[PDB]
Amino acid sequence: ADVPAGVTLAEKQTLVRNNGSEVQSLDPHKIEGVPESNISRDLFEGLLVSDLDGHPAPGVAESWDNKDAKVWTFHLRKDAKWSDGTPVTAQDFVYSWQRSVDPNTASPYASYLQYGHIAGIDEILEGKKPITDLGVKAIDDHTLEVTLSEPVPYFYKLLVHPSTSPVPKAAIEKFGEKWTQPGNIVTNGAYTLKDWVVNERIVLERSPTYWNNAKTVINQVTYLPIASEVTDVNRYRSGEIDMTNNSMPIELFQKLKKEIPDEVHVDPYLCTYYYEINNQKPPFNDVRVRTALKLGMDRDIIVNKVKAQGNMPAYGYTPPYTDGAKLTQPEWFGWSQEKRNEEAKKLLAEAGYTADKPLTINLLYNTSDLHKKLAIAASSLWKKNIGVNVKLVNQEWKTFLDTRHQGTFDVARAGWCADYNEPTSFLNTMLSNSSMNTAHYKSPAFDSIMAETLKVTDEAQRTALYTKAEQQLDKDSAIVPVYYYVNARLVKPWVGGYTGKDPLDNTYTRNMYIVKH
């Protein structure tokens, strides 16, 4: 943290944040969600971190080199240390990345380093080649060399993601899944784990072995797992919570904005709210049925509910403000809803679903006051607009994510947030082979467009291809875009170091401080 001149720090440097739900895991290879990443960024530190503006900055690596954006060499800082005093080495990263891509690990982010095209990865992910063939090596204890199968100019931007953080071999092998328990866990971020009470709290405490501990200010941070936005705000107003989750109660926003205007932060956020269709679940294996569902949704009515927060109605997957995106709106997005509804019902009839023989589907969502209200509106809209009957099903975060990977759902509320600020962070999740493809969308044509993005010579051509990717995704009605996110949360006046200027919102507790109050 960089505390300004004049600021008087409080004696008690402690922070309470709502994390929104109970984490899947504290193992960096077993996570895929925002809540999981939030805690992971305090506990483990990779080669690079995000600075306050979201730009990649030195983490364990203090400097780095690249040849032709294909061989990357990272010089690791000599004082990088684990919480048990031992050094963080190149060898740690080799072990960790290998573990990330091992089929036996079953990481939901197994495909993340394949987004960077590390040599050997394709056949390792399929179980045809051993993990030790991965193109990552420890040249010496403090020099990590990564070899890619082709130039990837943005490869370095991936390396801030927690799935690329190092993990402690000895704790994992001694304790298996219990390695992340308070007595067993070994960490290399600014904090370590103090306490973990399921469905109550996770308490982290400052770790003096952290190389940059001298700059850390907060001594203890508590993360809470409260899924109810309304409860989050209530416990904020009564003094328990210092920072809410970035999920507002629709109905309370304007009142908050009127009563405590200086505590309401609203910033750009590179995430898209959508209804993910299970493309492998009949009848949604029919492009006509998916298209009907996409067109029949009234984005204007949904967005109008959160209007005060400034959300924009969505026409695709990749947020239009993503670095490197110059997206086009498809023709259907310029129609009236009436016209959209008429098209949708004709499509349904072509597929054989009529007024007299209507479709009933299940809409899955994760427990949340916001998603519930929006799901009730979505069901009502679909019934009235295109004659589809929609039943709601709610599941807790961890299980919700499980269900979507297992494919035991029809349609699901979903939100995806960039992991690095470049359109492949989104588009690579719809690759046929991706560990993150919960839509179960498989288009050889799409995959082929994405393979072309790394064969072109300049960034303008790459940008034009990302637009071709989105157009293909839309032509296949893989998902039902709803709205582009904003990052809206409550932050107490004495909390310092929250700038909100990173559009991916990768904040670190080590950057905050408590002003005397």
Coordinates of C-alpha atoms in Angstrom, one line a residue:
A1 CA 0.0 0.0 0.0
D2 CA 1.1 3.6 -0.7
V3 CA -0.4 5.7 2.1
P4 CA -0.4 9.4 1.2
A5 CA 1.3 12.2 3.1
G6 CA -1.1 13.7 5.7
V7 CA -3.2 10.6 6.2
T8 CA -3.2 9.4 9.8
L9 CA -3.5 5.6 10.0
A10 CA -5.8 3.9 12.5
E11 CA -4.3 1.8 15.3
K12 CA -6.4 -1.2 14.3
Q13 CA -5.5 -2.2 10.8
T14 CA -8.2 -4.7 10.1
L15 CA -10.7 -5.1 7.2
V16 CA -14.0 -6.9 6.8
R17 CA -15.1 -7.6 3.2
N18 CA -18.1 -9.6 1.9
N19 CA -16.9 -12.2 -0.6
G20 CA -20.4 -13.1 -1.7
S21 CA -20.3 -16.9 -1.2
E22 CA -18.4 -19.8 0.3
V23 CA -15.3 -20.5 -1.8
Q24 CA -15.1 -23.7 -3.9
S25 CA -11.5 -24.1 -2.5
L26 CA -8.4 -22.3 -1.5
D27 CA -6.3 -24.6 -3.8
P28 CA -5.3 -22.3 -6.8
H29 CA -5.8 -25.3 -9.2
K30 CA -9.4 -26.1 -8.0
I31 CA -11.0 -22.7 -8.5
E32 CA -12.7 -20.8 -11.2
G33 CA -14.8 -18.0 -9.5
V34 CA -14.4 -14.4 -8.5
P35 CA -14.8 -15.1 -4.8
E36 CA -12.1 -17.8 -5.0
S37 CA -9.7 -15.5 -6.8
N38 CA -10.3 -12.7 -4.3
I39 CA -9.0 -14.7 -1.5
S40 CA -6.3 -16.4 -3.6
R41 CA -4.7 -13.1 -4.6
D42 CA -4.1 -12.4 -0.9
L43 CA -2.6 -15.9 -0.2
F44 CA -0.6 -16.7 -3.3
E45 CA 1.5 -14.6 -5.8
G46 CA 2.5 -15.5 -9.3
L47 CA 5.1 -14.2 -11.6
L48 CA 3.1 -10.9 -12.1
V49 CA 0.4 -9.0 -10.3
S50 CA -2.0 -6.3 -11.3
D51 CA -1.0 -2.7 -10.3
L52 CA -3.8 -0.3 -9.1
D53 CA -4.8 0.5 -12.7
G54 CA -5.0 -3.1 -13.7
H55 CA -1.7 -3.2 -15.7
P56 CA 0.6 -6.2 -15.3
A57 CA 3.4 -5.5 -12.8
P58 CA 6.2 -7.4 -11.1
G59 CA 5.2 -10.2 -8.7
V60 CA 7.6 -13.0 -7.9
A61 CA 9.3 -12.0 -11.2
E62 CA 11.2 -8.7 -10.8
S63 CA 12.1 -8.6 -14.5
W64 CA 11.5 -10.6 -17.7
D65 CA 12.6 -11.1 -21.3
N66 CA 11.0 -12.5 -24.5
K67 CA 12.3 -13.6 -27.9
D68 CA 9.6 -13.2 -30.6
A69 CA 6.9 -13.4 -27.9
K70 CA 7.6 -17.2 -28.0
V71 CA 10.4 -17.8 -25.4
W72 CA 9.8 -15.9 -22.2
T73 CA 12.4 -15.7 -19.5
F74 CA 11.4 -14.5 -15.9
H75 CA 14.0 -13.4 -13.4
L76 CA 12.6 -14.2 -10.0
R77 CA 13.5 -11.9 -7.1
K78 CA 15.9 -13.5 -4.6
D79 CA 13.9 -12.6 -1.5
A80 CA 10.6 -14.3 -2.7
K81 CA 9.7 -16.5 0.2
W82 CA 7.0 -18.9 1.4
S83 CA 5.3 -18.5 4.8
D84 CA 7.6 -21.2 6.2
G85 CA 10.7 -19.2 5.4
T86 CA 11.8 -21.3 2.4
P87 CA 12.6 -19.7 -1.0
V88 CA 10.1 -19.5 -3.8
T89 CA 12.0 -20.9 -6.8
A90 CA 11.7 -21.5 -10.6
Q91 CA 11.3 -25.1 -9.7
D92 CA 8.2 -24.2 -7.7
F93 CA 6.6 -22.8 -10.8
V94 CA 7.5 -25.7 -13.0
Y95 CA 5.9 -28.1 -10.5
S96 CA 2.8 -25.8 -10.2
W97 CA 2.1 -25.3 -13.9
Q98 CA 2.6 -29.0 -14.5
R99 CA 0.1 -29.7 -11.8
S100 CA -2.4 -27.2 -13.3
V101 CA -2.5 -29.2 -16.6
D102 CA -2.4 -32.7 -15.2
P103 CA -5.6 -34.6 -15.9
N104 CA -5.5 -36.1 -12.4
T105 CA -5.8 -32.5 -11.0
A106 CA -9.1 -31.9 -12.9
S107 CA -8.6 -28.2 -12.7
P108 CA -11.5 -26.1 -14.0
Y109 CA -8.6 -23.9 -15.3
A110 CA -6.6 -26.7 -16.8
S111 CA -7.0 -25.0 -20.2
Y112 CA -5.7 -21.6 -19.0
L113 CA -2.1 -22.1 -19.9
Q114 CA -3.2 -23.6 -23.3
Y115 CA -4.6 -20.1 -23.9
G116 CA -0.9 -19.1 -23.9
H117 CA 0.2 -22.1 -26.0
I118 CA 3.0 -23.4 -23.9
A119 CA 4.9 -26.1 -25.9
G120 CA 3.6 -29.6 -25.3
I121 CA 0.4 -28.6 -23.7
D122 CA -2.3 -29.9 -26.2
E123 CA -1.3 -33.6 -25.8
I124 CA -0.6 -33.2 -22.0
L125 CA -4.1 -32.0 -21.5
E126 CA -5.5 -35.0 -23.4
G127 CA -3.4 -37.5 -21.3
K128 CA -1.3 -38.6 -24.2
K129 CA 2.0 -37.1 -23.0
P130 CA 3.4 -36.7 -19.4
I131 CA 3.2 -33.4 -17.6
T132 CA 7.0 -33.1 -17.5
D133 CA 6.9 -32.5 -21.3
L134 CA 5.4 -29.0 -20.6
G135 CA 7.5 -26.2 -22.1
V136 CA 8.5 -24.7 -18.7
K137 CA 11.9 -25.1 -17.1
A138 CA 14.0 -23.9 -14.2
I139 CA 17.2 -22.7 -15.8
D140 CA 18.4 -22.1 -12.3
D141 CA 16.7 -21.4 -8.9
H142 CA 15.7 -17.8 -10.0
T143 CA 15.2 -18.0 -13.7
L144 CA 12.1 -19.5 -15.2
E145 CA 12.0 -20.2 -19.0
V146 CA 8.7 -20.7 -20.8
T147 CA 8.7 -21.9 -24.4
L148 CA 5.5 -21.4 -26.4
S149 CA 4.6 -23.2 -29.6
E150 CA 4.0 -19.9 -31.3
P151 CA 4.3 -16.1 -30.7
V152 CA 1.7 -14.9 -28.2
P153 CA 2.4 -11.2 -27.6
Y154 CA -0.1 -11.0 -24.7
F155 CA 1.2 -14.2 -22.9
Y156 CA 2.6 -12.1 -20.0
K157 CA -0.9 -10.7 -19.1
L158 CA -2.2 -14.2 -18.3
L159 CA 0.4 -14.6 -15.5
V160 CA -1.5 -12.5 -13.0
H161 CA -4.2 -15.1 -12.7
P162 CA -4.2 -17.3 -9.5
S163 CA -4.3 -20.6 -11.4
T164 CA -0.7 -19.6 -12.5
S165 CA 0.4 -19.0 -8.9
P166 CA 3.0 -21.3 -7.3
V167 CA 1.8 -24.0 -4.9
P168 CA 3.8 -25.9 -2.2
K169 CA 4.7 -29.4 -3.4
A170 CA 5.5 -30.8 0.1
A171 CA 2.2 -29.7 1.8
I172 CA 0.1 -31.0 -1.2
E173 CA 1.8 -34.4 -1.2
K174 CA 1.7 -34.8 2.6
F175 CA -1.9 -33.5 3.1
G176 CA -3.7 -34.0 -0.2
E177 CA -6.8 -31.9 -0.2
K178 CA -6.3 -30.9 3.5
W179 CA -3.2 -28.9 2.5
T180 CA -5.1 -25.6 2.6
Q181 CA -6.3 -26.1 6.2
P182 CA -5.0 -23.4 8.6
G183 CA -2.3 -25.7 10.2
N184 CA -1.1 -27.1 6.9
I185 CA -1.2 -24.3 4.3
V186 CA 2.0 -22.7 3.1
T187 CA 1.6 -19.5 1.1
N188 CA 3.6 -16.8 -0.7
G189 CA 1.3 -13.8 -0.9
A190 CA 1.0 -10.9 1.6
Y191 CA -1.3 -13.0 3.8
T192 CA -1.7 -16.5 5.2
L193 CA -4.7 -18.3 6.5
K194 CA -5.7 -17.9 10.1
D195 CA -9.1 -19.4 10.3
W196 CA -11.7 -20.9 8.0
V197 CA -15.3 -21.5 9.2
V198 CA -17.5 -22.9 6.5
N199 CA -20.4 -20.6 5.7
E200 CA -19.2 -18.1 8.3
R201 CA -15.8 -16.5 7.6
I202 CA -12.2 -16.8 6.3
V203 CA -9.7 -14.8 8.3
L204 CA -6.3 -14.1 6.8
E205 CA -3.3 -12.5 8.7
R206 CA -0.4 -10.5 7.4
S207 CA 2.6 -12.7 6.5
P208 CA 6.0 -11.2 7.5
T209 CA 7.9 -13.5 5.2
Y210 CA 6.3 -11.8 2.2
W211 CA 9.0 -10.1 0.2
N212 CA 7.0 -6.9 0.0
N213 CA 5.7 -7.1 3.6
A214 CA 7.2 -3.6 4.4
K215 CA 4.6 -2.1 2.2
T216 CA 1.6 -4.0 3.6
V217 CA -0.6 -2.1 6.1
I218 CA -3.7 -4.2 6.9
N219 CA -2.8 -6.8 9.6
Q220 CA -5.9 -8.9 9.2
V221 CA -8.6 -9.2 6.6
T222 CA -11.8 -11.2 7.0
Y223 CA -13.8 -12.5 4.0
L224 CA -17.5 -13.2 4.5
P225 CA -19.7 -15.6 2.4
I226 CA -23.0 -13.7 2.3
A227 CA -25.0 -14.4 -0.9
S228 CA -27.8 -12.1 0.0
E229 CA -27.1 -8.6 -1.4
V230 CA -29.7 -7.1 1.0
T231 CA -28.0 -8.8 4.0
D232 CA -24.6 -7.6 2.8
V233 CA -25.8 -3.9 2.7
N234 CA -27.6 -4.3 6.1
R235 CA -24.5 -5.6 7.8
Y236 CA -22.5 -2.8 6.0
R237 CA -24.9 -0.1 7.4
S238 CA -24.7 -1.5 10.9
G239 CA -20.9 -1.3 11.0
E240 CA -19.8 -4.9 10.6
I241 CA -18.7 -4.8 6.9
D242 CA -16.1 -2.3 5.5
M243 CA -16.6 -3.3 1.9
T244 CA -19.6 -5.0 0.3
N245 CA -19.5 -7.4 -2.6
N246 CA -19.9 -5.8 -6.0
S247 CA -23.5 -6.9 -6.2
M248 CA -26.1 -4.4 -5.3
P249 CA -29.8 -4.9 -4.3
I250 CA -31.7 -3.5 -7.3
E251 CA -34.3 -1.8 -5.2
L252 CA -31.9 -0.2 -2.6
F253 CA -29.4 1.4 -5.0
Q254 CA -30.9 4.9 -5.4
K255 CA -31.6 5.2 -1.7
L256 CA -28.0 4.3 -0.9
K257 CA -26.8 6.8 -3.6
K258 CA -29.0 9.5 -2.0
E259 CA -28.0 8.7 1.7
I260 CA -24.4 7.8 1.5
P261 CA -23.3 9.1 -2.0
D262 CA -19.5 9.2 -1.1
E263 CA -19.5 5.5 -0.1
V264 CA -21.1 4.3 -3.4
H265 CA -18.4 3.4 -5.9
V266 CA -19.4 2.6 -9.5
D267 CA -16.6 1.7 -11.9
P268 CA -16.2 0.0 -15.4
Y269 CA -16.1 -3.8 -15.1
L270 CA -15.1 -6.2 -18.0
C271 CA -17.8 -8.8 -17.3
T272 CA -20.9 -9.9 -19.1
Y273 CA -24.2 -11.1 -17.5
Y274 CA -25.9 -13.8 -19.6
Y275 CA -28.1 -16.8 -19.7
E276 CA -25.9 -19.7 -20.7
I277 CA -27.6 -22.3 -22.7
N278 CA -26.6 -26.0 -22.3
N279 CA -25.8 -26.5 -26.1
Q280 CA -25.8 -30.3 -25.6
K281 CA -29.1 -30.6 -23.8
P282 CA -32.2 -31.2 -26.0
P283 CA -33.9 -29.2 -27.3
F284 CA -31.1 -26.7 -27.0
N285 CA -28.9 -28.7 -29.4
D286 CA -31.1 -27.0 -32.0
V287 CA -29.7 -23.7 -33.1
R288 CA -33.3 -22.5 -33.9
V289 CA -34.4 -23.1 -30.3
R290 CA -31.4 -21.3 -28.9
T291 CA -31.9 -18.4 -31.2
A292 CA -35.6 -18.2 -30.2
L293 CA -34.5 -18.0 -26.6
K294 CA -31.9 -15.3 -27.3
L295 CA -34.3 -13.1 -29.3
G296 CA -37.2 -13.5 -27.0
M297 CA -35.4 -12.0 -24.0
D298 CA -36.1 -8.3 -23.6
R299 CA -32.7 -6.8 -22.6
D300 CA -34.3 -3.3 -22.4
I301 CA -36.7 -4.4 -19.6
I302 CA -34.0 -6.2 -17.7
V303 CA -31.5 -3.3 -18.0
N304 CA -34.2 -0.8 -17.0
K305 CA -34.2 -2.5 -13.5
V306 CA -30.6 -1.6 -12.9
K307 CA -30.6 1.6 -14.9
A308 CA -29.4 3.7 -12.0
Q309 CA -26.2 1.7 -11.9
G310 CA -25.5 2.3 -15.6
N311 CA -25.5 -1.2 -17.1
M312 CA -25.6 -1.5 -20.9
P313 CA -27.7 -4.1 -22.7
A314 CA -25.6 -6.9 -24.1
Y315 CA -25.5 -8.1 -27.8
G316 CA -22.5 -10.5 -27.5
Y317 CA -20.1 -12.2 -25.0
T318 CA -16.9 -10.2 -25.1
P319 CA -17.5 -6.8 -23.4
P320 CA -17.2 -4.1 -26.2
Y321 CA -14.8 -2.0 -24.0
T322 CA -12.3 -5.0 -23.7
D323 CA -8.8 -3.9 -24.9
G324 CA -8.5 -5.1 -28.5
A325 CA -12.2 -5.4 -29.2
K326 CA -14.0 -3.4 -32.0
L327 CA -17.3 -5.3 -32.0
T328 CA -20.3 -4.9 -34.3
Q329 CA -23.9 -5.2 -33.2
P330 CA -25.8 -7.9 -35.0
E331 CA -28.9 -7.0 -37.0
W332 CA -31.4 -8.6 -34.6
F333 CA -30.2 -6.2 -31.8
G334 CA -31.5 -3.2 -33.9
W335 CA -35.0 -4.7 -34.2
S336 CA -38.0 -3.9 -32.0
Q337 CA -38.8 -6.6 -29.4
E338 CA -42.1 -7.3 -31.2
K339 CA -40.2 -8.2 -34.4
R340 CA -37.7 -10.2 -32.3
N341 CA -40.6 -12.1 -30.7
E342 CA -42.2 -12.9 -34.0
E343 CA -38.9 -14.2 -35.4
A344 CA -38.4 -16.4 -32.2
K345 CA -41.8 -18.0 -32.4
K346 CA -41.4 -18.9 -36.1
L347 CA -38.0 -20.4 -35.2
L348 CA -39.7 -22.5 -32.4
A349 CA -42.3 -23.7 -34.8
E350 CA -39.7 -24.7 -37.4
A351 CA -38.2 -26.8 -34.6
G352 CA -41.6 -28.2 -33.8
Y353 CA -42.4 -26.3 -30.6
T354 CA -45.8 -24.5 -31.0
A355 CA -48.4 -22.8 -28.9
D356 CA -50.3 -26.1 -28.4
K357 CA -47.0 -28.0 -27.7
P358 CA -45.0 -25.5 -25.7
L359 CA -41.5 -25.9 -24.2
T360 CA -40.9 -26.2 -20.5
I361 CA -37.3 -25.6 -19.3
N362 CA -35.4 -25.1 -16.0
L363 CA -33.5 -21.9 -15.3
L364 CA -30.7 -22.6 -12.9
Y365 CA -29.2 -19.7 -10.8
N366 CA -26.9 -19.2 -7.9
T367 CA -28.5 -18.1 -4.6
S368 CA -28.7 -14.3 -4.7
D369 CA -31.4 -11.7 -4.3
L370 CA -30.3 -10.0 -7.6
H371 CA -30.3 -13.2 -9.7
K372 CA -33.6 -14.3 -8.3
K373 CA -35.4 -11.1 -9.2
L374 CA -33.8 -11.1 -12.7
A375 CA -34.6 -14.8 -13.1
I376 CA -38.3 -14.2 -12.2
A377 CA -38.4 -11.4 -14.8
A378 CA -36.6 -13.5 -17.4
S379 CA -39.2 -16.4 -16.9
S380 CA -42.0 -13.9 -17.1
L381 CA -40.6 -12.3 -20.3
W382 CA -40.0 -15.7 -22.0
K383 CA -43.5 -16.9 -21.3
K384 CA -45.2 -13.7 -22.6
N385 CA -42.9 -13.1 -25.5
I386 CA -42.2 -16.5 -27.0
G387 CA -44.5 -18.9 -25.1
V388 CA -41.8 -20.8 -23.2
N389 CA -42.5 -22.0 -19.6
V390 CA -39.6 -21.5 -17.3
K391 CA -39.2 -23.0 -13.8
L392 CA -36.6 -21.6 -11.4
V393 CA -34.0 -23.7 -9.7
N394 CA -31.5 -22.3 -7.2
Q395 CA -28.2 -23.8 -5.9
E396 CA -25.4 -22.6 -3.8
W397 CA -22.3 -21.2 -5.6
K398 CA -20.0 -24.3 -5.3
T399 CA -22.8 -26.7 -6.4
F400 CA -24.1 -24.3 -9.1
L401 CA -20.7 -24.3 -10.7
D402 CA -20.5 -28.2 -10.4
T403 CA -23.9 -28.6 -12.1
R404 CA -22.9 -26.5 -15.1
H405 CA -19.7 -28.5 -15.6
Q406 CA -21.7 -31.7 -15.3
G407 CA -24.3 -30.4 -17.8
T408 CA -27.3 -31.3 -15.6
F409 CA -29.0 -28.1 -16.5
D410 CA -31.0 -26.5 -19.4
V411 CA -30.3 -22.8 -19.1
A412 CA -28.3 -21.0 -16.3
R413 CA -27.7 -17.5 -15.1
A414 CA -24.0 -16.8 -15.7
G415 CA -21.4 -14.1 -15.4
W416 CA -18.0 -14.2 -16.9
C417 CA -15.2 -11.7 -16.0
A418 CA -12.0 -11.2 -17.9
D419 CA -8.9 -12.9 -16.4
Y420 CA -6.7 -10.7 -18.6
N421 CA -7.7 -7.7 -20.6
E422 CA -7.8 -9.1 -24.2
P423 CA -10.6 -10.7 -26.0
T424 CA -9.4 -14.3 -25.9
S425 CA -9.9 -14.3 -22.2
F426 CA -13.6 -14.6 -23.1
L427 CA -13.5 -16.2 -26.5
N428 CA -11.1 -19.0 -25.5
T429 CA -13.8 -20.3 -23.1
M430 CA -16.0 -21.2 -26.0
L431 CA -13.3 -23.4 -27.6
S432 CA -14.5 -26.9 -28.1
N433 CA -11.7 -28.2 -25.9
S434 CA -11.8 -25.7 -23.1
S435 CA -12.0 -26.7 -19.4
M436 CA -14.2 -23.5 -19.0
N437 CA -16.8 -24.3 -21.6
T438 CA -19.9 -24.7 -19.6
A439 CA -22.2 -23.8 -22.5
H440 CA -20.9 -27.1 -24.0
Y441 CA -20.6 -25.2 -27.2
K442 CA -18.6 -27.0 -29.9
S443 CA -18.1 -25.3 -33.3
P444 CA -15.2 -26.4 -35.5
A445 CA -15.7 -23.1 -37.4
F446 CA -15.3 -21.0 -34.2
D447 CA -12.2 -23.0 -33.1
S448 CA -10.7 -22.3 -36.6
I449 CA -11.4 -18.6 -36.4
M450 CA -9.6 -18.6 -33.0
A451 CA -6.6 -20.6 -34.3
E452 CA -6.3 -17.8 -37.0
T453 CA -5.9 -15.1 -34.4
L454 CA -2.3 -16.2 -33.7
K455 CA -1.3 -16.7 -37.3
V456 CA -1.9 -13.1 -38.4
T457 CA 0.9 -10.6 -38.3
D458 CA -0.6 -7.5 -36.7
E459 CA -2.9 -6.5 -33.9
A460 CA -5.5 -4.9 -36.2
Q461 CA -6.0 -8.2 -38.0
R462 CA -6.3 -10.0 -34.7
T463 CA -9.0 -7.5 -33.6
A464 CA -10.9 -8.0 -36.9
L465 CA -10.9 -11.8 -36.3
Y466 CA -12.2 -11.5 -32.7
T467 CA -15.2 -9.7 -34.3
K468 CA -15.5 -12.7 -36.7
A469 CA -15.4 -15.0 -33.7
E470 CA -18.2 -13.1 -31.9
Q471 CA -20.3 -13.0 -35.1
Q472 CA -20.0 -16.8 -35.3
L473 CA -20.9 -17.3 -31.7
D474 CA -24.0 -15.1 -32.2
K475 CA -24.9 -16.8 -35.5
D476 CA -24.9 -20.1 -33.4
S477 CA -26.8 -18.5 -30.5
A478 CA -24.5 -20.2 -28.0
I479 CA -25.7 -17.9 -25.2
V480 CA -28.3 -15.3 -24.4
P481 CA -26.5 -12.0 -23.7
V482 CA -28.3 -9.9 -21.2
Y483 CA -26.1 -6.9 -19.9
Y484 CA -22.5 -5.8 -19.5
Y485 CA -21.6 -5.4 -15.8
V486 CA -20.5 -2.4 -13.8
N487 CA -18.4 -2.8 -10.6
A488 CA -20.7 -1.2 -7.9
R489 CA -20.0 -1.6 -4.2
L490 CA -20.1 0.2 -0.9
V491 CA -16.8 1.1 0.7
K492 CA -16.5 2.8 4.1
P493 CA -15.0 6.3 4.2
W494 CA -11.9 5.2 6.2
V495 CA -11.0 2.4 3.8
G496 CA -8.2 3.7 1.6
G497 CA -6.5 2.1 -1.4
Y498 CA -9.6 1.2 -3.3
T499 CA -9.3 3.2 -6.5
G500 CA -11.7 1.1 -8.6
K501 CA -9.6 1.9 -11.8
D502 CA -8.9 -1.7 -12.7
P503 CA -11.7 -2.8 -15.0
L504 CA -11.0 -6.5 -13.9
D505 CA -11.2 -5.5 -10.2
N506 CA -8.2 -7.5 -9.1
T507 CA -7.7 -5.7 -5.8
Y508 CA -5.2 -6.9 -3.2
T509 CA -5.6 -6.4 0.5
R510 CA -1.9 -5.4 0.7
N511 CA -2.8 -2.2 -1.2
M512 CA -5.4 -1.0 1.4
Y513 CA -5.2 0.8 4.7
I514 CA -7.5 2.1 7.4
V515 CA -7.6 5.9 8.0
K516 CA -8.1 7.0 11.6
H517 CA -11.8 7.6 12.3

